[PDB]
């Protein structure tokens, strides 16, 4: 009769479909920062992205 599992901050980590009772894991979609690698502009202007 269990339905889902919560983490610390009321963040659900499971779900059961109302039609077909199945266990489904859930994870957040990716995010992060973007940085630019740049040599001295007195030498060149070619960069890289991380």
């Amino acid at each position: 009769f269990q339905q889902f599992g919560r983490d610390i901050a009321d963040t659900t980590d499971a779900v059961r479909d109302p039609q077909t009772l199945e266990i489904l894991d859930i994870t957040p979609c990716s995010f992060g920062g973007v940085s630019v690698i740049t040599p001295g502009t007195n030498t060149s202007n070619q960069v890289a992205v991380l």
Binding site: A9, T11, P28, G32
Partner: peptide, 23 residues
Amino acid sequence: PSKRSPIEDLLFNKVTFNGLTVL
């Protein structure tokens, strides 16, 4: 596998994303 002293190994053995990350 990692070039550690026995004392270092013992030391390392004893010590045990909601918008925020770790680096």
